[PDB]
Amino acid sequence: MRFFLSPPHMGGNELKYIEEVFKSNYIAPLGEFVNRFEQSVKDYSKSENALALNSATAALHLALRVAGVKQDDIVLASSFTFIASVAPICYLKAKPVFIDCDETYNIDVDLLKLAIKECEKKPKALILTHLYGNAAKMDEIVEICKENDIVLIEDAAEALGSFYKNKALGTFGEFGVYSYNGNAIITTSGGGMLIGKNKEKIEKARFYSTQARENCLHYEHLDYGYNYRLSNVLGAIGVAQMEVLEQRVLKKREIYEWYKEFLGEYFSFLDELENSRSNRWLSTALINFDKNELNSCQKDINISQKNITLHPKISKLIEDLKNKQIETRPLWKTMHAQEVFKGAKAYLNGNSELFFQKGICLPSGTAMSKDDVYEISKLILKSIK
């Protein structure tokens, strides 16, 4: 393939810091660059607490554990998301209630109110995805969660570098998670950060992350925990990648603006919320789309596996570009159509399914030039007419 969605983009101080790790001989999930990695996420996000982990999935698992979610507790979540977001609900055997999205790709604010209202019992938490870097309607969701005493866990796994009203996505919730998996805006080759408001709670996540050891020489355990802690070698990568995070954000936004410029007449590019700044982690576009097709229903279902057919120009577009060795992908297939979540409760308004029909993820690698985006865009244009 010539172009991937969002491959690694390295070329900083990664090797240099890794060599410092080798010199230290802390070849372990702890050490100076774990610490520095967490410092850098605090410096950037302005969250006061950060815990370097091996994945954002782990971060969410810990956020939920530390929030006191138990078996059969209700956890609200975004339907329009990647399964990692909600897999931890399954780990804790909590009961997921999935909620459709709005014009930002994120949980719809009125559906949220509906879903909470109709829970058979007070929901304990909400995992809010910020899909593709886009901010959800935070003042509203935050307030709703405050009003209902719902722990907000922002899943900003795709949204490191996104902002709403000058605040880092991740810093509104009690908890925030960022991914540094291989295709994230920056990477540790696999990694994550759990940030949060409560220093005790984060430090409790920290305790869980290293097998729930009491502070003593022998092994003493009042609870059970995990091995979730991030490798210091990978922490080094994290540090060097954090050095270019903002540069990456700035570039992903340029690439999106380019796509808009080359494809604007023929695709719909939904706007980020005024008073936000999406990291545009992937540039996405909707074909044959009118915003007034949104909210074509308001219902709750028990989920069944559902086959959703791509708009024909999307499936052709994917195939055409694949033949020219350009990776594109459908938008995330809603959890409300997934077999894994058979039986679980979901609120629909039609939107996530409609986005899956008409949407596409475009190559958004920050190593691409304008000319790259240009040649990709004209193959996209060739394909559709």
Binding site for a second copy (CB under 8 A): 7-8, 10, 14-15, 18-19, 22, 25-30, 54-58, 71, 82-84, 86-87, 90-91, 93, 181-183, 187-190, 211-212, 217-227, 229-234, 237, 305, 318, 329-330, 332-333, 338-341, 356
28 sits near ligand 4RA (criterion: CB under 6 A): yes
Shortest separation between residue 121's beta carbon and ligand 4RA, angstroms: 26
377 binds, among ligand 4RA, a second copy, none (CB under 5 to 8 A by kind): none
| Choice between 181 and 283, CB closer to a second copy | 181
| Interatomic CA distance for residues 50 and 42, integer angstroms | 6
Q: Which of 296, 278, 305, 284 is nearest to 356 (CA)?
A: 284
Shortest separation between residue 198's beta carbon and ligand 4RA, angstroms: 21
Within 278-317, the residues that bind ligand 4RA by CB under 6 A are none
Residue partners of 361: CB distance under 8 A and separation at least 6: 5, 132, 282, 283, 284, 328, 329, 330, 331
Contact stretch for ligand 4RA (CB under 6 A) within 154-162, 238-246, 291-299, 352-360: 154-162
Q: Which of 166, 172, 134 is nearest to 152 (CA)?
A: 172
158 sits near ligand 4RA (criterion: CB under 6 A): yes
143 binds, among a second copy, ligand 4RA, none (CB under 5 to 8 A by kind): none
Rounded to the nearest 10 degrees, the angle between the axes of helix 56-66 and helix 199-209 is 120
| Interatomic CA distance for residues 246 and 90, integer angstroms | 34
85 binds, among ligand 4RA, a second copy, none (CB under 5 to 8 A by kind): ligand 4RA
| Interatomic CA distance for residues 132 and 100, integer angstroms | 15
Within 105-144, the residues that bind ligand 4RA by CB under 6 A are 129
| Choice between 10 and 114, CB closer to a second copy | 10
| Interatomic CA distance for residues 316 and 380, integer angstroms | 10
| Interatomic CA distance for residues 83 and 334, integer angstroms | 9
Compute and round to an integer the Cα radius of gyration of the chain: 21
Q: Which of 252, 237, 98, 231 is nearest to 160 (CA)?
A: 252
| Interatomic CA distance for residues 355 and 289, integer angstroms | 9
Q: Which of 52, 66, 144, 157 touches ligand 4RA by CB under 6 A? A: 157
| Choice between 117 and 216, CB closer to a second copy | 216
Q: Which of 73, 102, 108, 155 touches ligand 4RA by CB under 6 A? A: 155
Q: What share of the chain is helix, strand, coil (3-state, %, to 5)?
A: 40, 15, 45
| Interatomic CA distance for residues 57 and 61, integer angstroms | 6
| Choice between 194 and 262, CB closer to ligand 4RA | 194
- Paired sense of beta strands 95-99 and 74-78, if any: parallel
Backbone angles phi, psi at 35, to 5 degrees: -70, -45
| Choice between 252 and 336, CB closer to a second copy | 336
62 HSE (CA, 13 A, CB side): 36
55 sits near ligand 4RA (criterion: CB under 6 A): yes
Contact stretch for ligand 4RA (CB under 6 A) within 142-150, 153-161, 244-252, 318-326: 153-161
Structure tokens at 341: 């979540």
Answer left, alpha or beta for residue 110, where phi above 0 means left and psi between -120 and 50 means alpha. Answer: alpha
Within 189-218, the residues that bind ligand 4RA by CB under 6 A are 192, 210-211, 213
**Nearest residue by C-beta to ligand 4RA?**
182
Size of the chain, expressed as the number of residues it contains: 385
221 binds, among ligand 4RA, a second copy, none (CB under 5 to 8 A by kind): a second copy
| Choice between 227 and 302, CB closer to ligand 4RA | 227
173 sits near ligand 4RA (criterion: CB under 6 A): no
73 binds, among ligand 4RA, a second copy, none (CB under 5 to 8 A by kind): none
10 binds, among a second copy, ligand 4RA, none (CB under 5 to 8 A by kind): a second copy
Residue 13 three-state SS: coil
Binding stretches for ligand 4RA (CB under 6 A): 4, 6-8, 25-30, 55-57, 81-82, 84-85, 129, 155, 157-158, 179, 181-183, 192, 210-211, 213, 227
